[PDB]
Design a protein around this ligand. Structure first.
Ligand SMILES: [Cl-]
Length: 123
C-alpha cells in the first residue's frame, strides 16, 4: 500500500521549485488522505489527471475538488515560531485568514505563530 511519504515524494517529483504553496498542499493532501485511508484514491486521481494532460498543479487542485474528504474541509493549522520559518516561495501567498476558509477554495493551511498571529496560505 502506498504510504503518505511515498505519495508526497511522487507528487514533489512533478513540481517545479521548492517550498512553494503547491509543496505545502502536497503535505496537506497526504496528511488528510492518510487520516481518512484515502491515499489510494488520491494517488489514482493524481496519476489520472497527469495522464489526461493536466499540469501537476492542476492535478493537485483537482484532488481538492474531486476527492470527497476535501469537501468544505477547513485548512489544517500549522504551528510555527515566526513568519520567517515559512519557506521563501510561500511568503507572497500568505494572506489574512478569511471567514470560513476551505481547502477546496484554495486555502491550503493556516500558520499560527508563537505570538498568536495567523496567516492563511492561498492558491
Ligand atoms: Cl516527503
Amino acid at each position: 500500500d502506498i504510504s503518505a511519504k511515498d505519495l508526497r515524494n511522487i507528487m514533489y517529483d512533478h513540481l517545479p521549485g521548492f517550498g512553494t504553496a503547491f509543496h505545502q498542499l502536497v503535505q496537506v493532501i497526504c496528511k488528510l488522505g492518510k487520516d481518512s485511508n484515502s491515499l489510494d484514491i488520491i494517488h489514482a486521481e493524481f496519476q489520472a489527471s497527469l495522464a489526461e494532460g493536466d499540469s501537476p498543479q492542476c492535478a493537485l487542485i483537482q484532488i481538492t475538488k474531486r476527492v470527497p474528504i476535501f469537501q468544505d474541509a477547513a485548512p489544517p493549522v500549522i504551528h510555527i515560531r515566526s513568519r520567517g520559518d515559512i519557506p521563501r516561495a510561500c511568503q507572497k501567498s500568505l494572506r489574512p485568514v478569511p471567514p470560513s476558509p476551505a481547502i477546496d477554495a484554495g486555502w491550503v493551511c493556516v500558520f499560527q505563530l508563537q505570538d498568536g498571529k495567523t496567516l492563511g496560505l492561498k492558491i
